[PDB]
Enzyme design. Structure first.
Site, PDB file in Angstrom:
ATOM      1  CD  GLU H  60      -6.168   2.087  -7.642  1.00  0.00           C
ATOM      2  OE1 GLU H  60      -5.362   3.035  -7.576  1.00  0.00           O
ATOM      3  OE2 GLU H  60      -6.430   1.495  -8.708  1.00  0.00           O
ATOM      4  CG  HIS H  61      -1.991  -2.147  -5.309  1.00  0.00           C
ATOM      5  ND1 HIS H  61      -1.666  -3.194  -6.141  1.00  0.00           N
ATOM      6  CD2 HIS H  61      -1.602  -1.020  -5.949  1.00  0.00           C
ATOM      7  CE1 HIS H  61      -1.052  -2.726  -7.210  1.00  0.00           C
ATOM      8  NE2 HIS H  61      -1.006  -1.409  -7.122  1.00  0.00           N
ATOM      9  CD  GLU H 137       0.715  -1.460 -10.170  1.00  0.00           C
ATOM     10  OE1 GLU H 137       0.057  -2.198 -10.932  1.00  0.00           O
ATOM     11  OE2 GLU H 137       0.193  -0.804  -9.259  1.00  0.00           O
TER      12      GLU H 137
END
Ligand code: 3PE
Ligand code: HEM
Lengths: 49, 78, 52, 53, 420, 55, 101, 446, 292, 89
Positions: H60-61, H137
């Site tokens: 997803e990154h 994150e």
């Protein structure tokens, strides 16, 4: 991180009906609490007698 | 494009404050909570100056100088 | 002054609580029969007809 | 009520002869009536009489 | 296809608008020109407590009746507030709209405003201000409005700490009887016919008739404010005055902010097309974000840049952003980027009117400001009728005007306004 | 130092009950009577104990 | 007629709290409804009620009464807790009829 | 005029079509000028084997950092050329890449999505940069105690199963993360029959079907080993995790029981149960007149900062319970009150509370489905979970079947006399022992 | 900090110094609320080892002989270098700050740059400060010889106080007007004081009033050193500022050498200079810097 | 104070005859006029209203009132408000 926080194995403490991580619970759960409350019930019968 | 809050794109909920009196069915994002913070200390009330003679001398005219004593109360001069 | 307790919600609450209260009354009746050895009841139960 | 309690105390030390039976029956009836009936009625009467309700 | 939006200008000044969506749930809102623009210095924080008094006792409906009646039908009552107008909106199932409109209009026309209820509510407004000031953008925009305007827009959204415990019921009644007057009310409804809204408006809202107390006329003062609070990040907002709402220069400033960077488009995106992000990314190597701020009210606007950067590198970020805007003002812009900014602005407006609540906010705002509704196609045509010379002129107006700078963080390396 | 009346775990009960108990100022002599009952109770116990020593 | 009012005045004099400087509304035994009614009072009426109760307790301690000119008269006996108490009972009855349904 | 059921009948039907690859192409049309087009993939963190735990999150990154056809930020420039919004998420069971755009650019956005489906270039410098970003994150998400409590509850409720592991995985897996395992994950978890292309808003189903036949044709169609990956059931474990750290000002406690799953219909009834209890936080304006007894008690006694109730469902499993943040000095009392409410729904659920919960559930179900984006999310998750888009009229028919008897029967089935999972974080000394909580999960008076 | 901030003069002076300077003089006397609970002992050791150095300290004794002072100086004090850290020159900023806190009286300080310690204009600024008014001399008087109080009371009828604020540092300085007025009468008091100072700056003043101001300044300086603690404070301040002792008669004859043109020049420099304003109170009627 | 009165001038040494002259004629030939009587009448009323908020002064006045009851030491220096409303020339 908090995602490193992992529960270790309890397989040297668990009951035989919940040793498998693949099969679901809630099928043998009523049997387990039936056994435990049966122990509690016969103790309470004895002390009431 | 009217509706100033919607005209400003990223600063939509910063320029407008929204609250509710009756909660909705949809749960709001970022529920939020006030942490238990500190409290200011309680000090005795000071003399008001409601006449022109009591205000005489209350105006500052010098650089401000603080003084902390050990067994002397802490004082300040204007 | 219990006219507060007249309504459909209290009636539904009482109707829900009838069978639990009846079962607790059954437990209390059996406990009072067993602990006192009442001859009006144990002479009707088939197994316990040995002490009388 | 207090005087009725005094009357019942006096009657209780008396035998069952005339006129103690009727006096004791009236005393017990008035005792139960004052405790149960007449005191809330009097409370409601002064509640009305002081414009409380 | 649903029916068209239809308007009615009542003789007491009230503007009612309704669109029959045939929606499963109807949303009905009243928009009142009674923001914090209309508070002087002696009644600060009255609009905040009036916003939080939407469930107090009214005539015909108590607090218990209002809360237990809206909460039983599943619908909701909410109130939003800019610095210029408030909006009381209820929403719920279409079989409940009669009691929902009854509750809304009883809340917004005749509140009793009892003393013990506002005495209970003042602690709630303190908690509300604490939750709202838990973030960092709200405080710096609040200080930016404090320093940007000298009157009538420096009044904050939230009640000041000295006023807590000092708002009485009398000034709440005074604020309601001055600014909740029928000439500045827009009653809008999605999912409800015009007959129901018209009959309720004519049967119930003939209490006030006047224009009300107005005449704020906010003025610009400029300057700067510094908040040393020791955060590792530094927030900065540098704005200047700009044109009001309802003008071609407002569209020019919106095209300018979407050219300079008006928020992200990609989750964890690199902000390739934002000019300020391009300049700082070619200048720096630290995490940051730089966006363009534009708040255009009915009489004045604020346009500028908003940076969040490091404490040790705030000066280079702010200088790079200001030099990028100076480069745009000199004429260094291509027509493809202006076309991309126009497409971004059109898509942003069309996504803003996508959901029903944003659409109803747009209906209420245009009904208050203009008394009618422009279709979105006309708004897109007004966007498309902007030249790049207007964008250059807007940037030149921002650069060559006096500034308002609000800064927060470790401001040892943060430059002052004289150094920009 | 400290206040031994209010901080001792046993003397705190006597302080809360019979020393620093807030009481109405206008109670009449009838409010003595219950306390007298308690005194009379222990009097009975004391006399009863000696009547238990020869009965 | 006026006979009932005069007989009410005679009973008001016979009750005896007016000889302590009290009013009728001070003599209410405070339940939760009366407690909320006192909580909704303005500060001046609350202070007057507290001083009247304190003076009545001070007089009852000494087994004395006020002089006859300082007795609370039947005419100016203002009924100050009645509207607050009426709204408290009305709101409680609203909560009661909601909870009974 | 129109009633509620007629208005729900007038909602347009979701059109569903199939491809030769196995792709599910679904669309809902409204009269909006915007649209939301997304791809939903049945590949979350449940499909990993403890050595590739952060693989889907790291995909997803890297999904938005360039492709083979569009190398680098030019791809991002394309999304900013038309003013489109590009969003994504990854769950424990689903992955979604969605774009909000206009309708006139409806062809090219589909092609853009197709690029992110099947041509995601994975440069090694981008791997190192996104590794740093993921570590940044995760250490940012450690600050939010709610997500930490959510992950703790999932770790202690499904121990030893692939459902205990987090979406982001452990830190060491992020450090030693290669490219070959990402290529293997992309090969074996991004196949055509596990994908739904969903569109909501100003779309045409025939045009979208033609675009999916053009761009999304031949995605994988091949398992590459003739080994279909499946999902074994996950064992629920009644257990308790307590993270004690007294320096935090507030404590977060979540208590859950095992949920039924997705296809089991009593979910709907359980939603009504949550609608009886609801949610509360300190910014509300109801006071003591709130309808929920837990919320009214928490306001009156100043117990909790906030509470919420959740019914999280996965493939034949789930969690069902409450999560509250409060100060330390109230924690035990809050637990007591919460348990009482659950036993009330197991014993004395009245008809008025059931009607209020049904109205709240109707309001939540319709009020969620506003705008194109939650409708597209509903379409994608409905075709992935139920295999079909359940219409709102069927939701209304399912809500109308609920009375108080079956509600208290279902609550006695799932809540009564069951072992909960407890996750705590903060000053949780006054959080009761597991024996006390398990005792509080039943009543001696029944 | 909470005790010392009970006086609004303290908060106004703190905000005035915060606005008046960019750095190196805007640091507060009192600790900020964010810094509380975050000041470590390592920073205190760093401050002590960088600022308590040998060539920045003067040991001053009254009632004690010199030889034991020198013995204590060579015993306890001789392990430090002398320079430490220099400073950041205290650049001027300008501007205004307004604090709406809801007080019965509005406090407003309007200040500009002035002379530092040691210049020939600092004595002229002190003479101008005592000319405009820098404190009462009579208990419950009317301040007839104060120009600011007379100019304000010419048009006012409410309680007030106007004084001249003066502060001198090693590199920079501050001079201005301090006004305590009512909430609705702040603009009249501020404008009256500013017009009085603008009239002084245009040469409209009496030389007899300058002589009275010189006598007041000499009297205040001589009364500041009659006590032992004031004498010790003045000796220590002179030893730190200049490194030599100045007898009081030399200070008086330096006061006497101030010309009237120096007072006019100081007033003109205050009028023409950039302003810093600190206001606190109900500021609905308090004016702004560009509205003066 | 309650038993003393002081009028003092601090000045230079050079102005000794002038300060002796002012101290002599202040305590001997003080001019009183009715406009000044009412002006400091309202001024002392406002001074007493200000001094009511200083709790230490209120407590020490209470202590002097209750420790010296019925004596001239109980009355304060300022006196009650009825006297300053009724004192005359
Ligand atoms: C007037 C004075 C003449 C002499 C002057 C010398 C001074 C004496 C004192 C003067 C007092 C002046 C008035 C101030 C006192 C207060 C008012 C008062 O006490 O009034 C007398 C009282 C009137 O009744 P009151 O309670 O005021 O109000 C009732 C509502 N109308 O009236 C009463 O309370 C009368 C009560 C009569 C009760 C009769 C009971 C009969 C039945 C008893 C049965 C008990 C035994 C039952 C046994 C049953 C079994 C055998
Ligand atoms: C624990 C404490 C007590 C003890 C040990 C106790 C013991 C005794 C004894 C031994 C007697 C018989 C002696 C006699 O009467 O010749 C007696 C008699 C009696 N006791 Fe108690 N007693 C106690 C408390 C009380 C109390 C509390 C009461 C009630 C107030 C009470 C009422 C009586 C009465 C009425 C008699 C009969 C006296 C008589 O002969 O006329 N006793 N008690």
């Amino acid at each position: 991180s908090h995602t490193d926080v992992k529960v270790p194995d309890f397989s040297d403490y668990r009951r035989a009906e919940v040793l498998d991580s693949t099969k679901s619970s809630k099928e043998s759960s009523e049997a387990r609490k039936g056994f435990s409350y049966l122990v509690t019930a016969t103790t309470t019968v004895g002390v009431a007698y | 494009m009217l509706s100033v809050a919607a005209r400003s794109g990223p600063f939509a909920p910063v320029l407008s404050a929204t609250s509710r009196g009756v909660a909705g069915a949809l749960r709001p994002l970022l529920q939020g909570a006030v942490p238990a913070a500190s409290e200011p200390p309680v000090l005795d009330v000071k003399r008001p100056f409601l006449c022109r003679e009591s205000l005489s001398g209350q105006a500052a005219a010098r650089p401000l100088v603080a003084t902390v004593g050990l067994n002397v109360p802490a004082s300040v001069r204007f | 002054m219990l006219s507060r307790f007249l309504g459909p919600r209290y009636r539904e609450l009482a109707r829900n609580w009838i069978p639990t209260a009846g079962m607790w009354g059954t437990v209390g009746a059996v406990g009072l029969v067993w602990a006192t050895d009442w001859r009006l009841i144990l002479d009707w139960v088939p197994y316990i007809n040995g002490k009388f | 009520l207090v005087a009725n309690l005094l009357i019942l105390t006096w009657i209780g030390g008396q035998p069952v002869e005339h006129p103690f039976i009727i006096i004791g029956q009236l005393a017990s009836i008035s005792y139960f009536s004052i405790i149960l009936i007449l005191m809330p009625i009097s409370g409601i009467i002064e509640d009305k009489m002081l414009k409380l309700y | 296809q649903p029916q068209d939006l239809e308007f009615t200008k009542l003789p007491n000044g009230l503007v009612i608008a309704s669109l029959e969506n045939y929606a499963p749930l109807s949303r009905i809102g009243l928009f009142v020109k009674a923001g914090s623009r209309y508070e002087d210095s002696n009644n600060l924080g009255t609009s905040h407590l009036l916003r939080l008094a939407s469930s107090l006792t009214t005539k015909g409906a108590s607090s218990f009746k209002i809360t237990r009646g809206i909460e039983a039908v599943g619908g909701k009552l909410s109130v939003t507030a800019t610095r210029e107008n408030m909006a009381y909106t209820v929403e719920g199932i279409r079989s409940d709209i009669e009691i929902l409109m009854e509750f809304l209009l009883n809340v917004t026309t005749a509140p009793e405003f009892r003393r013990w209820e506002v005495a209970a509510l003042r602690s709630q407004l303190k908690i509300d201000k604490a939750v709202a000031f838990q973030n960092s953008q709200t405080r710096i925009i609040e200080n930016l409005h404090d320093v940007a305007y000298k009157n009538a827009l420096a009044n904050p959204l939230y009640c000041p700490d000295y006023r807590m415990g000092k708002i009485t019921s009398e000034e709440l009644h005074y604020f309601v009887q001055n600014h909740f007057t029928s000439a500045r009310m827009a009653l809008v409804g999605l999912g409800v016919s015009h007959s129901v809204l018209k009959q309720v408006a004519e049967q119930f809202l003939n209490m006030r008739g006047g224009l009300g107390l107005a005449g704020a006329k906010a003025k610009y003062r400029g300057g700067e404010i510094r908040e040393q609070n020791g955060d590792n990040l530094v927030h900065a907002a540098i704005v200047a005055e700009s044109a009001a709402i309802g003008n071609a220069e407002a569209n020019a400033f919106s095209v300018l902010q979407h050219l300079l960077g008006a928020g992200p488009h990609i989750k964890r995106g690199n902000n390739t097309t934002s000019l300020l992000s391009q300049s700082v990314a070619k200048g720096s190597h630290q995490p940051f974000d730089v966006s363009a701020f534009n708040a255009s009210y009915s009489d004045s606007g604020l346009f500028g840049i908003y940076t969040i950067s490091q404490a040790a590198a705030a000066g280079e970020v702010i200088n790079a952003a200001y030099n990028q805007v100076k480069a745009v003002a000199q004429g260094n812009l291509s027509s493809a980027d202006v076309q991309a900014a126009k497409n971004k602005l059109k898509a942003g407006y069309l996504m803003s009117v996508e959901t029903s609540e944003g659409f109803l906010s747009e209906i209420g705002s245009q009904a208050l400001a203009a008394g009618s509704y422009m279709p979105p196609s006309t708004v897109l045509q007004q966007i498309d009728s902007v030249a790049d010379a207007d964008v250059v002129k807007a940037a030149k107006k921002f650069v060559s005007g006096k500034k308002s700078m609000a800064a927060s963080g470790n401001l040892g390396h943060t430059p002052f306004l004289d150094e920009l | 130092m400290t206040n031994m009346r209010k901080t001792h775990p046993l003397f705190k009960i006597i302080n809360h009950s019979f020393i620093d108990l807030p009481a109405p100022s206008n109670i009449s002599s009838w409010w003595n009577f219950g306390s007298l009952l308690g005194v009379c109770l222990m009097v009975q116990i004391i006399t009863g104990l000696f009547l238990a020593m020869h009965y | 007629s006026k006979w009932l009012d005069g007989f009410r005045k005679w009973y008001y004099n016979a009750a005896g709290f007016n000889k302590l400087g009290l009013m009728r509304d001070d003599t209410l035994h405070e339940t939760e409804d009366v407690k909320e009614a006192i909580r909704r009072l303005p500060e001046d009426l609350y202070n007057d009620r507290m001083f009247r109760i304190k003076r009545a307790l001070d007089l009852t301690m000494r087994h004395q009464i006020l002089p006859k000119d300082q007795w609370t008269k039947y005419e100016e006996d203002k009924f100050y807790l009645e509207p607050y108490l009426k709204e408290v009972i009305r709101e409680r009855k609203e909560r009661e009829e909601w909870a009974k349904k | 005029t129109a009633t509620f059921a007629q208005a729900l009948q007038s909602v347009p039907e979701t059109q569903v079509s199939i491809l030769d690859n196995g792709l599910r192409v679904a669309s809902e049309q409204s009269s909006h000028a915007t649209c939301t087009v997304g791809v939903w993939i049945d590949a979350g963190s449940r499909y990993e084997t403890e050595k590739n735990n952060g693989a889907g999150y790291f995909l997803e990154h890297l999904a938005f950092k360039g492709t083979k056809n569009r190398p680098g930020n030019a791809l991002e420039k394309e999304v900013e050329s038309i003013g489109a919004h590009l969003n994504a998420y990854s769950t424990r069971e689903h992955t979604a890449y969605l774009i909000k755009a206009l309708s006139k650019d409806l062809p090219k956005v589909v092609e853009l999505l197709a690029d992110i489906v099947q041509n995601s270039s994975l440069e090694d410098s981008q791997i190192e940069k996104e590794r740093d970003v993921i570590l940044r994150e995760m250490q940012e998400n450690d600050a939010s105690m709610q997500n930490v409590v959510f992950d703790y509850l999932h770790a202690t409720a499904f121990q030893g199963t692939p459902l205990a592991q987090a979406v982001e995985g452990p830190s060491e897996n992020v450090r030693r993360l290669s490219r070959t395992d990402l290529t293997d994950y992309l090969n074996r978890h991004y196949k055509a029959p596990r994908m739904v292309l969903a569109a909501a808003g100003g779309v045409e189903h025939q045009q979208l079907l033609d675009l999916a036949q053009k761009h999304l044709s031949s995605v994988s169609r091949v398992y590459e080993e003739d080994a279909v990956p499946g999902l074994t059931p996950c064992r629920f474990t009644g257990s308790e995790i307590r993270h004690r750290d007294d320096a935090l000002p507030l404590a977060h406690v979540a208590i859950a029981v095992e949920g039924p799953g997705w296809a089991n219909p009593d979910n709907v009834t359980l939603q009504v149960a949550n609608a009886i209890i609801g949610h509360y936080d300190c910014t509300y304006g109801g006071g003591v007149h709130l309808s929920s007894p837990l919320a009214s008690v928490a306001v009156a006694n100043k117990l909790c900062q906030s509470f919420q109730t959740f019914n999280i469902s996965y493939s034949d499993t789930g969690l069902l319970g409450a999560h509250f943040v409060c100060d330390a000095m109230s924690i035990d009392d809050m637990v007591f009150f919460l348990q009482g409410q659950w036993m009330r729904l197991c014993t004395s659920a009245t008809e008025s509370e059931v009607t209020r919960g049904k109205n709240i559930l109707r309001n939540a179900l319709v009020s969620h489905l506003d705008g194109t984006t939650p409708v597209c999310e509903d379409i994608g998750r409905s075709l992935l979970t139920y295999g079909r888009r359940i219409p709102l009229a069927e939701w209304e028919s399912r809500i109308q079947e609920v009375d108080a008897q079956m509600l208290r029967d279902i609550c006695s089935k799932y809540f009564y006399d069951q072992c909960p999972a407890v996750a705590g974080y903060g000053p949780i000394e006054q959080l009761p022992d597991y024996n006390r909580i398990r005792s509080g999960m039943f009543w001696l008076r029944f």
